[PDB]
Each structure stands twice: as structure tokens, then as C-alpha cells.
Amino acid sequence: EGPEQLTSRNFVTLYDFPNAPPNLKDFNTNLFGDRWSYTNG
Amino acid sequence: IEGEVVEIQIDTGGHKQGKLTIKTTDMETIYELGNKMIDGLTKEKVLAGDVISIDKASGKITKL
Amino acid sequence: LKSLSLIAAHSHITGLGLDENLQPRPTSEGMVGQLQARRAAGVILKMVQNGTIAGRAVLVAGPPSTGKTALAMGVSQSLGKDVPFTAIAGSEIFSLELSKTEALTQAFRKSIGIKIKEETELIEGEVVEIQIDRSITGGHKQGKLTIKTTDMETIYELGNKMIDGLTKEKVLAGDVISIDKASGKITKLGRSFAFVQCPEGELQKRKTVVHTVSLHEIDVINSRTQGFLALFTGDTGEIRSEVRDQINTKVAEWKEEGKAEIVPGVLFIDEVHMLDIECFSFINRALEDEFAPIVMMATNRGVSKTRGTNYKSPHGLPLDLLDRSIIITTKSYNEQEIKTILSIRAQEEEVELSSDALDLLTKTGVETSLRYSSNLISVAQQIAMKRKNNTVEVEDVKRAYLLFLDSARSVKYVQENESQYIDDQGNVQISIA
Amino acid sequence: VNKLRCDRRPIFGKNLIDLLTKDRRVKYDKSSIIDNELIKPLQTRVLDNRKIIDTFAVLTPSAVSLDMRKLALGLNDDSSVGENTRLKVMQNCFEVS
Amino acid sequence: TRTAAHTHIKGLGLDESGVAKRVEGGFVGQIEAREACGVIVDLIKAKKMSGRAILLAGGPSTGKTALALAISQELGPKVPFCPLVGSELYSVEVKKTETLMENFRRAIGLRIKETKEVYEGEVTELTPEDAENPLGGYGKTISHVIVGLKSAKGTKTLRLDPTIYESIQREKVSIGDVIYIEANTGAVKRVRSDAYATEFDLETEEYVPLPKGEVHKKKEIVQDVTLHDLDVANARPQGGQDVISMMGQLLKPKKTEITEKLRQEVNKVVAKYIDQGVAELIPGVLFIDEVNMLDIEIFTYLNKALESNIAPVVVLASNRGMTTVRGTEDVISPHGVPPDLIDRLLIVRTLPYDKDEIRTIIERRATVERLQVESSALDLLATMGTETSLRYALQLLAPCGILAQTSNRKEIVVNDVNEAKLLFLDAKRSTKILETSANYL
Amino acid sequence: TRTAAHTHIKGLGLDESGVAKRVEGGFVGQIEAREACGVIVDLIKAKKMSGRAILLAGGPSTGKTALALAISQELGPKVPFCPLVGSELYSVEVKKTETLMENFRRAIGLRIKETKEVYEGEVTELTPEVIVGLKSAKGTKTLRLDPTIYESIQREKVSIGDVIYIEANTGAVKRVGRSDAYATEFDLETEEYVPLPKGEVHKKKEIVQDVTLHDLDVANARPQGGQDVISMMGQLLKPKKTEITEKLRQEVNKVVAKYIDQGVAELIPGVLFIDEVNMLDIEIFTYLNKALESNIAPVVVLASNRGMTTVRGTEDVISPHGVPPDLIDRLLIVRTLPYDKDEIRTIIERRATVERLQVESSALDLLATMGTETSLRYALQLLAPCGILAQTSNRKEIVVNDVNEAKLLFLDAKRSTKILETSANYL
Ligand SMILES: Nc1ncnc2c1ncn2[C@@H]1O[C@H](COP(=O)(O)OP(=O)(O)O)[C@@H](O)[C@H]1O
Ligand SMILES: Nc1ncnc2c1ncn2[C@@H]1O[C@H](COP(=O)(O)OP(=O)(O)O)[C@@H](O)[C@H]1O
Ligand SMILES: Nc1ncnc2c1ncn2[C@@H]1O[C@H](COP(=O)(O)OP(=O)(O)O)[C@@H](O)[C@H]1O
Numbered sequence A: 001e002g003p004e005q006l007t008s009r010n011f012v013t014l015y016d017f018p019n020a021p022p023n024l025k026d027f028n029t030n031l032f033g034d035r036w037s038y039t040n041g
Numbered sequence B: 001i002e003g004e005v006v007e008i009q010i011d012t013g014g015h016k017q018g019k020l021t022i023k024t025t026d027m028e029t030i031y032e033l034g035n036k037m038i039d040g041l042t043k044e045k046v047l048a049g050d051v052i053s054i055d056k057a058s059g060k061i062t063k064l
Numbered sequence C: 001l002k003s004l005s006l007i008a009a010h011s012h013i014t015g016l017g018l019d020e021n022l023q024p025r026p027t028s029e030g031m032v033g034q035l036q037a038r039r040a041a042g043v044i045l046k047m048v049q050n051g052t053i054a055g056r057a058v059l060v061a062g063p064p065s066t067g068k069t070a071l072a073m074g075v076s077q078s079l080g081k082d083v084p085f086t087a088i089a090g091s092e093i094f095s096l097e098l099s100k101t102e103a104l105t106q107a108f109r110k111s112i113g114i115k116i117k118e119e120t121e122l123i124e125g126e127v128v129e130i131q132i133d134r135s136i137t138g139g140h141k142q143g144k145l146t147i148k149t150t151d152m153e154t155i156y157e158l159g160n161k162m163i164d165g166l167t168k169e170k171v172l173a174g175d176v177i178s179i180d181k182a183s184g185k186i187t188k189l190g191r192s193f194a195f196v197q198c199p200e201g202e203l204q205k206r207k208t209v210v211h212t213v214s215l216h217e218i219d220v221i222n223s224r225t226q227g228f229l230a231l232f233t234g235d236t237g238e239i240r241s242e243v244r245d246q247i248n249t250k251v252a253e254w255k256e257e258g259k260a261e262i263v264p265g266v267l268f269i270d271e272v273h274m275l276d277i278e279c280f281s282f283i284n285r286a287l288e289d290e291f292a293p294i295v296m297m298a299t300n301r302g303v304s305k306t307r308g309t310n311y312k313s314p315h316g317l318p319l320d321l322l323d324r325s326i327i328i329t330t331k332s333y334n335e336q337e338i339k340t341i342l343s344i345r346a347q348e349e350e351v352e353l354s355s356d357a358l359d360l361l362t363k364t365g366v367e368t369s370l371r372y373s374s375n376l377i378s379v380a381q382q383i384a385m386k387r388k389n390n391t392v393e394v395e396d397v398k399r400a401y402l403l404f405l406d407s408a409r410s411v412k413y414v415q416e417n418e419s420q421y422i423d424d425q426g427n428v429q430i431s432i433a
Numbered sequence D: 001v002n003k004l005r006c007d008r009r010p011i012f013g014k015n016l017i018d019l020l021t022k023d024r025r026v027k028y029d030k031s032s033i034i035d036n037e038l039i040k041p042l043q044t045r046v047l048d049n050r051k052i053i054d055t056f057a058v059l060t061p062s063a064v065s066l067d068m069r070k071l072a073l074g075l076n077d078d079s080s081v082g083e084n085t086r087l088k089v090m091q092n093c094f095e096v097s
Numbered sequence E: 001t002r003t004a005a006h007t008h009i010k011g012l013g014l015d016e017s018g019v020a021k022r023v024e025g026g027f028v029g030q031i032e033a034r035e036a037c038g039v040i041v042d043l044i045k046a047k048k049m050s051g052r053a054i055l056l057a058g059g060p061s062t063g064k065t066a067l068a069l070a071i072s073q074e075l076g077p078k079v080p081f082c083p084l085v086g087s088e089l090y091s092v093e094v095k096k097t098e099t100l101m102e103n104f105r106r107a108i109g110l111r112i113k114e115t116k117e118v119y120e121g122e123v124t125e126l127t128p129e130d131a132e133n134p135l136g137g138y139g140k141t142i143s144h145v146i147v148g149l150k151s152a153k154g155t156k157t158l159r160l161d162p163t164i165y166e167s168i169q170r171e172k173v174s175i176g177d178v179i180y181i182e183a184n185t186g187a188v189k190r191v192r193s194d195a196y197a198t199e200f201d202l203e204t205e206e207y208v209p210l211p212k213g214e215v216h217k218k219k220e221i222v223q224d225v226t227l228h229d230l231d232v233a234n235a236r237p238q239g240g241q242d243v244i245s246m247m248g249q250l251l252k253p254k255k256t257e258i259t260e261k262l263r264q265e266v267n268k269v270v271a272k273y274i275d276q277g278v279a280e281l282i283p284g285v286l287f288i289d290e291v292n293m294l295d296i297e298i299f300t301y302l303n304k305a306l307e308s309n310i311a312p313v314v315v316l317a318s319n320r321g322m323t324t325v326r327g328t329e330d331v332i333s334p335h336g337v338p339p340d341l342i343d344r345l346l347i348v349r350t351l352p353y354d355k356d357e358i359r360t361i362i363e364r365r366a367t368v369e370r371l372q373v374e375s376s377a378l379d380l381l382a383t384m385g386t387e388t389s390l391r392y393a394l395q396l397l398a399p400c401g402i403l404a405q406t407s408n409r410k411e412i413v414v415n416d417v418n419e420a421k422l423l424f425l426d427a428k429r430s431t432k433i434l435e436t437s438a439n440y441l
Numbered sequence F: 001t002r003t004a005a006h007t008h009i010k011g012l013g014l015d016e017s018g019v020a021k022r023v024e025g026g027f028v029g030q031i032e033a034r035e036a037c038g039v040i041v042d043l044i045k046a047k048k049m050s051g052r053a054i055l056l057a058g059g060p061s062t063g064k065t066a067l068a069l070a071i072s073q074e075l076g077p078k079v080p081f082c083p084l085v086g087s088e089l090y091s092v093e094v095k096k097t098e099t100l101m102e103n104f105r106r107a108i109g110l111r112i113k114e115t116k117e118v119y120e121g122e123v124t125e126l127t128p129e130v131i132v133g134l135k136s137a138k139g140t141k142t143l144r145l146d147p148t149i150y151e152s153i154q155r156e157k158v159s160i161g162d163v164i165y166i167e168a169n170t171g172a173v174k175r176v177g178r179s180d181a182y183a184t185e186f187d188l189e190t191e192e193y194v195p196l197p198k199g200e201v202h203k204k205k206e207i208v209q210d211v212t213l214h215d216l217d218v219a220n221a222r223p224q225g226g227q228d229v230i231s232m233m234g235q236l237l238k239p240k241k242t243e244i245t246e247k248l249r250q251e252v253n254k255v256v257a258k259y260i261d262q263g264v265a266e267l268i269p270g271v272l273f274i275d276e277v278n279m280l281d282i283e284i285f286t287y288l289n290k291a292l293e294s295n296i297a298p299v300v301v302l303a304s305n306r307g308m309t310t311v312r313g314t315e316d317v318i319s320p321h322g323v324p325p326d327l328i329d330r331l332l333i334v335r336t337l338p339y340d341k342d343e344i345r346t347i348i349e350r351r352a353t354v355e356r357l358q359v360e361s362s363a364l365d366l367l368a369t370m371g372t373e374t375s376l377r378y379a380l381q382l383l384a385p386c387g388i389l390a391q392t393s394n395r396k397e398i399v400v401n402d403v404n405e406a407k408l409l410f411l412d413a414k415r416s417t418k419i420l421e422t423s424a425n426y427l
């Protein structure tokens, strides 16, 4: 029994999120940049 | 673009100086600056009251 | 496993083809001819297999194209792997950056090696669950694994090294692993699923792993902090004499305690007729030590001037070297042996012939060199597919013979065309008239 | 200054950096993936041979003179090197793996 | 648009079943030599057995180099060809044998072919799809990551293993502008779309276009290298600021004595790869021109080396007769090659041309370089081509063209070649003047 | 149990009265040579003169190198020894004379003693400047140390709770491991926990190690044992061997003289042996005259099996033993005699015994006759193939038929030369 592409849980720890997205927040910061985030308008 | 960086208008805060004019003895233009160009200007910052040549071909800056 | 192979001049021979009572069979393992020479070669093979005799020099001799190099290749093949065998051409020791004596020392040290086995550990099984607890902007990490075999399961918790080893080499619930405690290295053993059944047996496995290292590499590894790279780049030399005897004492201690054993080897030098007399003088002393290997030399030269001197000596070697060495003689072949050799070559070259074609080939090989026929057969089988016949006939080999010139034929041709050929003095009649 | 250092060198002659970039330029997108194991860089080669270097490197020098190991690169408490240059040397070299 | 005594040879001009006509491939005469060379070409094309060698002998200006060039042209641009001269073997950095062995390996190449599967396009939204944690926990546990796709001539949408969370940690392109992913291995690659070039008046990164074609591509990569490059790269260091790399950056990396253990290792890896079915070894051909300049040590090392497993097929050229091989003085031998080496290879014989062959050669030389020659002038050119040498006649064409250009006539006339021959002297006339005078000339 | 042409020589076998017996110490005959060699043995044992020269000359198969090995073994391991061959002098990195001097300075030994101070214990804390804290089985001390070894410790991936070993004199740093007090922190940890050391952190010991002058010179000129980045970074820049200035030798001589005058060391003269010196160049030969006539050069012994020959490097002078008269005048000559039949037989049987082979008396007679006929080395070489040939027939002894078969199988010099003279193409 080896179905599916090897499901791997990506869990967060522990129930403490100053920013609601546990992983989307850092990805957004990398994509946009905190320094440049003040010029969005 | 050669010798046209006239004035730096730093700012709200962060990623500032996002638009500064350019000047020659006979020609002027306002140009907007992004975060990458902000970082490029950060290295060897100048008063911008002088005239500085910067590569419009996506290169770097060169003090005049 | 076997390495990449292309048919060579000596690819037809695999082992000496001798007998247990040291008897030479006429044909055994791509081999034929020179009975008593093969008996002597088997005797030398028994010498090297003994391991209690060192610093012996033997010399083969005979006319060109006789099998001396073939005999050396055969004895090396029969001796087999796991014993260090080195073959060196005489011209390879004339280095512009290395002393000839130093190069000979390096060759002698490379000739023999040492065998060491040590107890090793390993953990292998079907991984079931993997948990990694690493902190973001924290100070510590943690990991929990479930490892199970067919007969038992145990839970373990990781620390730091195995955590990064597991992360760097991606392991999932379906991919199976081997891990060593002291090494810490994580090796993939193939997925059971997501394809093999669950591995059986206890997780713990204690074994031994052996390692063979030739004496020259221990010699160089301790020479300099960057001396390890000399195993690859080779930009070393003039290793201080105060390292050689230290290494010798160390290996003597290793033998005395008994956890490390040594394997003497064979050093073969071909076309030794060309060499400097200083090399011979060094060899005279290099044979009088307890670490010298069995050295065999080859030379087709008869009486000739000794390089570095003016007088002539038999085989081109100074008399002292012959004094401390033995001579093995090789004799000229005959027609039936040539026919057998060509048949063997054709068989290993997947070449089909005809009886009269073989007769013509043997006639050529008995009136000319054997190698001439051994190349004529190849060019003939190359021609064979022009007429789209999977066979070789007399007219084919005749056309090949008249197409590719012979040494004697070319020599007799230049006897009457020297005017249009550049003379030794340089004068040549380029213009026809 | 205008007649000595205004423009004396930016007139090409020998070379110009833009020319070197144009020449040292690269027309390759991606190749030699098996750099993996086909090339096997020596940085991986040394660590792949960890066990043998542990089990074989035995010899040690018979004598050594201190104050020459540091003096070889010309940095001591009384040396001709600069003030911050000596510290910057190993500040750039200590980070070396 | 330029030539130097060659490049008018278009292959060997051998028809099917091994037959050579008169005029073809810029080649005329010496039929049997061309037949033998085609035989050798077919033997090399067999790619079955290696180590064979052949030498060809003849007078000067007999077209030996032309035959070798024709062989190289016939082989094609895949199997490597390594031109070399005997004098180039000598060096002041390594041993001669080391140079010979490295050239031997440089002769033989290797081709690797493989295919990769890649999904690429434009991502409308980069957001992982959260799901309930299978273990008793909290927060957000990603089960899949939906990736938008957009390409010219093909556009879809797909999802991936949430393990790419670390891959999406650092891309710095845009919000799903242009992407590059792999199926089996995953990963990402920074590749902004051209639709946002004009939104900013300034930009220091050239915008990249959207992928053209199917959203998923199965493209193959083929590379052809020699083992010499392989083990040179293996021996040579790499990296940046580490001690060995920075030391080598100022070490002037002169080549030095590549060891045989690297040769064994590269042999092992290429053997395991060809057994794996991913690599195909292509034996090459190596050319040593003017072999009479070699020495006894190189000859003996050649005898040893041609017995090796991976010795490529080599071709030797010489124009000496009853000469004495260098290094020694007592060895009288044909072409200055020791007899033992002669015993290990075959000989191809070349023959001098005739008046008609020289005339045809001159005609071909005139035709190739876009010149017009009168029949009488061409016949005269043939006359002193036979009288003195073919190469003198071949060289004399350009000056005659120049003199014709001076008086504004495209064609060439007899008096033009007379004037050219008067201006430029051959060898026999020059040595006649040298022997006549006594003023040190 | 490897045996190679030697190791049956256990010494000169000289009596305490300086009279050599016939058969002893694996030696037979050469009574005069052995007596002179023992005289030279006591000469070097005197350790009072320097720069003496002895040459022993004789034909081949006369045990000249055997005699040199015998005197070397009789002297023992306290005295330095360095065998050499003449061809080893020629190098490409340094001039020949400098290599000769280098081997001169390696042939005299120095016995020295010094106190080794070490600090070992458990790692407790690492306070940057650098102060360290060490915990022993019972003791505990805090140490301030140079930042170099601090950075070395950082490179040594030393963790908390580890146990380390420090050599104070050289700054050598080595981590033993981690204490077993905190051991089972992880189920499958790769680090090998080791027990806490017993004793005080501070420890003092004494050594009696020995070094040669060449070792001191190369250590002073070339430091090749560094640990911090600067050290090996500098020492990898000049891998090539260079020349050594004479002023360095004078400085080293001054410091060792001070050491021995103070009374913590003593000087040990040694022996330099050059084998087959006939091939040495004229320049080296005239350099020996200056090198020998010095104050520190040790005794030297030469071997040369020559006659009326021209020395290498010239083309005119014909000199005995390939040595010009200038070096002959400052030389002592030892004459070696060729052996005879019964000594040959004794040599053969002794070599067989040291090879643990069984040989029948008629076979020994045949071997002795053949050795007289051709050479001693021939029979010595071919006896082992006779042994294996007998072993093939599962016989532990040697029979005359087996010896004849082996002699048929393997050739000698004279038979090979005769075959070569009547050969088709220089066979
Ligand atoms: N008994 C034999 N069996 C097989 N091949 C042989 C035999 N005797 C001689 N040969 C062949 O003769 C050729 C010449 O032998 P080799 O020793 O390589 O050169 P040379 O004899 O000139 O030193 C070899 O290629 C070998 O294949
Ligand atoms: N059959 C031919 N067809 C065309 N050109 C030829 C022919 N034979 C000789 N040549 C010319 O001769 C030159 C080569 O001379 P070659 O025979 O290689 O000299 P060598 O004998 O010194 O090697 C080439 O420039 C080529 O143009
Ligand atoms: N008295 C002896 N006892 C034992 N072996 C001897 C004796 N004399 C000579 N030999 C042997 O004779 C050989 C010749 O020794 P060596 O001096 O190295 O060569 P050569 O005498 O030709 O210079 C040595 O291997 C040695 O074993």
C-alpha cells in the first residue's frame, strides 16, 4: 500500500500566531519585502 | 543616462526616495525609483545636487 | 563490476592457463605456446602468492612480437584482483620535475599495499513514522522516529547530527535507510513502497569492512597537510627520507599487533632496455630491503649500448643487474600456433573465416610479422560488409594485403624511390624533371 | 588637476571593464547537471575520505619552532603590516569553511 | 571566404561499395589511398575495437595532410578529431609522456543524452491549500499547494506536494509571474512577465516572457565532452572563498601530471553510466603530423600505450626515407620510425602525380577562389608546375590575379604568369644564385 | 616472515679481544674485513673525532653492503644511521651539494629532555575575551588562553559538557569527547560519550625524545605543524623544498652547544653510508674534500666495485675504484676477498636454513658446484624456486633432479649471453 505522492503533514507549533498565516506570511514578506511594503500605497 | 540625478527626496518611511528628478544643463525629467534602485543608491549615497551617470541599461551607477 | 572494455592487443588473454601441478596446457584461457616459459611464470606466481619472499628480480627475454608482454598480462590476470600489480614503461620515469630515484621509490611504494579490516555498525529497517520538531528563531530542535522490521519495532529520538543528515537526504515513510552510529551517515536502501517487502532481522547489525591502501598513499598522506591532494593532482615529490622509515616502523607495528595485514605485489617494467645507469644503480640497492616487491622486467634488445655509457652489454643492462636477476627466455612461434592465435582473435573479434583464408593468413604471418596478419584480419572483416557477405575469403585478404603496405614491402619500395624521399642529408628531388 | 587627472586612463588603450564583461560573457543557460557525481568536486572528495584520513594520518613532526608559524605570513606583535589589515586578514579567512 | 591550401576537399568522395571516381569532393588522383582511407573511416565508424594505428608514407606535397583532412570531414562533427604535430608534444611544464597520454584521452569523447519533465507558466495565485491535521494538533496543515499555470499555446491549473513550502521561501520574482518547476524533483527557478514592463519608468531587470508552447515540456539535453575535460575538472578545484579555491585563484594553474587513479575513477563512473543506459562513449581519432620529429622515449611510451583498453585510433604521417630516428644514431630505419613500432601498425602508400593531374589540381584551385584563367596560361602553369613543383604553381595564382587586377582584366594571361615567375623565384633558381655569388648569399 | 637477501646478518660476531672467528653472526670468512670493521665500530663508539673517511672496495658478491649493514646493526639504534645510494643525490628542487649537506646533518643525533605541561578536563563555560573553565574528577580550574586556540576550539566543534585535552607548550587542542555524566540524552546520538578523566587538570611529565640536527634546521626554516588558519595558510604557499643558508646552521649549532653546555642534552655522532659511489659526479667528489675537513661532519663509509675507471663528470683521469687521488689521500681502504667453494656451500646452506627449507647433501654439493661455476647470487636466487618445485611434488626436501629441473627452467648470465650471441634478431 503506497498510494498518492507520499503525503507529508506540514504542521505548525505552537498555537501562537502574531500573524494569522503561519507560512503564507513569510512567503508574502519574501515576495514583496518589508522595506518596500511601505510604498504600495 | 549621464549626469542627471538632481536632488533626492527621502520620505512616510522605508523604501523612501521613490521618485527624484534628473537634470542637465539643457534637459530635465522626473523619474520614479524602486526598492532595488533605492538599494543601489544607498551604496555610495550622494547629495544628488551634483550630476551623476547611471546605467539605464539595467547596470549600475557611476559617480561623475 | 566490470569496467568499460574495448578489444585490445591483449584482451584475448585471461589468466596464465596453467595446471595445479604447474603444468602448461597447449591451450587454456586465450593462451598458447612457450611451455617452459609459462612454467617459470607460474613459479613466479607461486612466489608472489607465498608472500614471505621479497626483493626478487626476474627478467624475460626474446625476439620482438613473442609474448613477453602477453605473458606479463596473463600472469597479472591469473594473480587476480586485491593484490597490487603495477605495470610501467621505462620512459615514464624520466620526469622534468621528479628525480629518477624518487620516481622509482614512488613506483616501489605503489607496488605493495596493506589490508585493514575494522568493526562497523549499521541500523537498517523499514521506517514507519518520522517526526521533526525544529524551532523557528528558537534554540533547539527535536526528532522522533518509528523504525520497524518484520520481527520487532523500537522508538528512538534524535538529537542534532542525525536530524540534519535526515533532512539533507530526503526520507519519507516509504523510503528505507541505513545509518551508522560513529559515521553518522544516512544511506538510502531503496523504497519498500510508494518497492520491496519489509526487511527482516534485528535492526542492529555488527559487521567488518575491509580497506586496501597501497604503501605509497600512506607515504604521501603523512608528508604534508595538503599532501592528500597529491593522490589526485600529483604535484608532490622529494618526500623526506624521515617519513619513509617512520611509515615502515608503523606498518611493522601493525603487522606485529595483527589487526592489519600487508599484501606484497608485483612491479612490471616493460622495455626496460632504455633507462639510465643511475636507475640501474638505484635498483641494485632497492632489491636489498625487506619491503621490495617481486619485480619483472622485459626487453627485446640484444647486445646494445647502455644508456648513459658507451660500452655495450647483453640486453642493454649492466652486468651487476644480471648478476642479481634471473633470465627467462622466449622462442619464436610456428605456423600452427599462429593459426590458433588468429582463430582465437577472430573468435573474440566475432570474425568468421575460411580454411584457405586462414592458410593464406598463416603463410603471411610466417613470412612477415604476426601483428601484420592480426591487423589484416581486422581490415578484411571491415571490408567484408562491402559485398554484404558475413564471411571472409581469399580474395578479400589478398585485396587487403595489396591495399595496406608491409614493412618489408615499404622498405623494398623506398629502395628505388630515395630520390623523391627526403634523404638524411635533407636533399630531395621534388621536381620530376 | 584638469591636465593631470581629469581623464587619463578612461581612454581605453590597454582595456576597459565593459569589454572584459562582453568577452568573459557566457552563452550557456544550464548544463552538466551530473556535476552531482560526474565531476565530484574535491571539496566533497576530502570529506568522502573521512574514515581513511582518521585511520591513516599518524606521523607527527619531530621538531617545531613556535613564533615562526605566525611569523610566516608576516604578522606578529612587532611586524611591518598595517593596523586593521592584519585583523581583516583572518576576519575574512576565519569564516572560510 | 578564405582558404589555406585546403578547405576545397569535400570529404573523400567515395561512393557506395567503396569506389572512388576521378573528380569529386575536390579530390583527384590516388584512388587506392582514398579507398584505404575510406576503409579506415568505416572501421572507426564501427565503434567496436580501438587501439589500431596506421602510418602513411610518401614524398613531399603528396596530399597526406589532405587525406587526413578528408578523413576528418568524412567522419563528421560528432566523433572528435585532434590535430597535432610531433613538435607540440614537447613542453617545459610536464613530461612528454604526460602530454601524449592526455592527448590520447582528449581524442576520445563521450555523449550523454537525457530528458527532463518541466511544468512552467504564469501563476494566478500562489497560496497553499490548508487542510485538517491528520495528527491531533492545531494551526494550519497544508495538504496541497495549488499553482496557477499560463503559457502561450497551452494553459492549465495544478496542485503539488506542500513540501515546496521551503522552495517558495525564496524566489523574488513577483506574485506568480513566471515559474519553473520539476515533477519528480520539484524545486523552483527565478524566471517578471513582460505585461508589467511599462508600469515602472525604470527597471534593472529585463522582463521575461511567458512560456511558449505546452504548459508541460519534456525536453531532452545532449552534451558531448571528452574524458580529458572530465578528469581535468575532477582534478581541478572549484568553489569560492574557501582556502583551496582562493589559493588556486593566484596559483597560475599549470597542468601537472594527472594521476592514474583519477583515470581509473572516471573509467569506473563512465562505465557504470553506459551500463545504466544514459551515456554513449564515442571513440575518436587522433592525428600526429610529421612524426619524424619524435624521440625514442615517446616511441616506447607509444608502444606501451597503444596496448591499453581505451587507446583511440591514431594516424601517423611522415615523408622520410632511410633516415636515422632521433635520440639515437645507430638505428637506421624507414621514415625515421623504430622497427618495433613499425611492426605494430600498417602502412599506406601514396604516389606522385603527373602533368595532367597537376593541371587538374590547378584548375580546381582556380575555380575554388573565384578566378578566371586562360587555357594557354593554365597549360603554362602546369608546365612549370611539373618542371619545379606543384606548390609553387598553386601559390603563384594569387600574384597573377593581382597583376591582372592592376591592368583591370578579370582573366589571366600568359605574360602575366611570365612576369610573376620573373618576380618570384623558385628553390632551384634561388640556390643557383646562392651558389654563384660569393658576397654571403 | 619476509626475507630478502639479508636479515641473516646478526652482526660482525667479533670477540671482545678484537679477533673474529670463522663462522658466527651469520657470517663466514672475511676475517680481516670484519676485524677492521670492528675497529671502526669502536672508533665511532669513542665519539671523540669527527670527519673521518673509510672506503671499502672489492668485487661483486663480496658482501660489501652486507658488511655495512653488519656494522650498522652492531652499533645499535642509539646512534643515528641513514643508508644512501649515490644516484639519490641528484635532485631537481635543490642543488646536489645542498642535498649532500642535508644528509650530513641528518646523520648526527641529539638526545634531549623537556617537561610537558597539559590541561585536561570537562568543558564548563566559554567566556569571550579568552577564559575557559575546566572540571576534573576532583579538581577544577579556570584558564585564560590565547584567542588562537579559542578559535581552534570553535573549529573543533566543541560543545558544552565536553572533555578536552590541551598541550600547554605547543597549544595543541584535542577533544576527547563528552562526559558520561550527561550521556543518555539522546536515543541514537552520534557523539561517543567518554568517561571523565581522573587527576588534577594541571599535569607535568618528562620526555627523553631524540632528534637530529637536520630536523632542527628544517623545523626552524619550515614550520609545518600549525593549527590556526594563518599557520597552514602560510605553510601551503611554498611547498617546494628550498635551500638552507649556512648562517641558519651556525645558529642551530650555537643553540645546541648552549643546550649541551647547560646540561640537558648530549651529542651523538653517527654514520653516513653511501653505496655505489663510483657514479658520483666530479663536483660532488671535490665537494666532499671541503665537507669532510670540518668540525661536525660525522664519519662516512663508501662502497665501489670498480678498477681503472674514469670518474663521472670528466673524460681524462683514470683512477682506481672511480675515485680521484685527491679524495683517495684522505681515505682509508679496506680490501674484500672473493669467496671459495666451502664458504660458498656454507653460505648456501645457511641461506636455506634461514628460509626454513630442507635440502639433501648431494643437492648442496650440486648447488656449491654450480655457484662456483657461475656465481653465488645465482644459486641464492634460484634455491627458492627449487623449494617450490619440490613442494609441487609434495616433498619438503630438495632433490638433485629438482635442482636440475629448476636450472633448466631458469637461465643464468653466461647461458643468456651465449644465446644472445647466436640469435636471429638480438633475442
Ligand atoms: N602463447 C600465446 N598466446 C597468445 N598470444 C600470444 C602468444 N605468444 C605470443 N602472443 C602474441 O604475440 C604478441 C606480441 O607479444 P608482446 O609480448 O606483446 O610483444 P613482444 O613479444 O614484442 O614484447 C602479443 O600481442 C600476443 O598476443
Ligand atoms: N588529390 C588532390 N586533390 C586536391 N588537392 C591536392 C591533392 N593532392 C595534393 N593536393 C594539395 O597538396 C597539398 C597537401 O600536400 P601533402 O601531400 O599533404 O604534403 P605532404 O606530402 O608534405 O604531407 C594540399 O594543399 C592540397 O591542396
Ligand atoms: N659472510 C657472509 N655471510 C652471509 N651472507 C653473505 C656473506 N658474504 C656475502 N654474503 C651475501 O652476498 C651478497 C652480496 O652482498 P652485497 O655487498 O650487497 O653485494 P656485493 O657483494 O655484490 O656488493 C649479500 O646479499 C649477502 O647476503
Ligand SMILES: [Mg+2]
Pocket: C065, C066, C067, C068, C069, C070
Ligand atoms: Mg611485448
Ligand SMILES: [Mg+2]
Pocket: E061, E062, E063, E064, E065, E066
Ligand atoms: Mg602535406
Ligand SMILES: [Mg+2]
Pocket: F061, F063, F064, F065, F066
Ligand atoms: Mg653489494
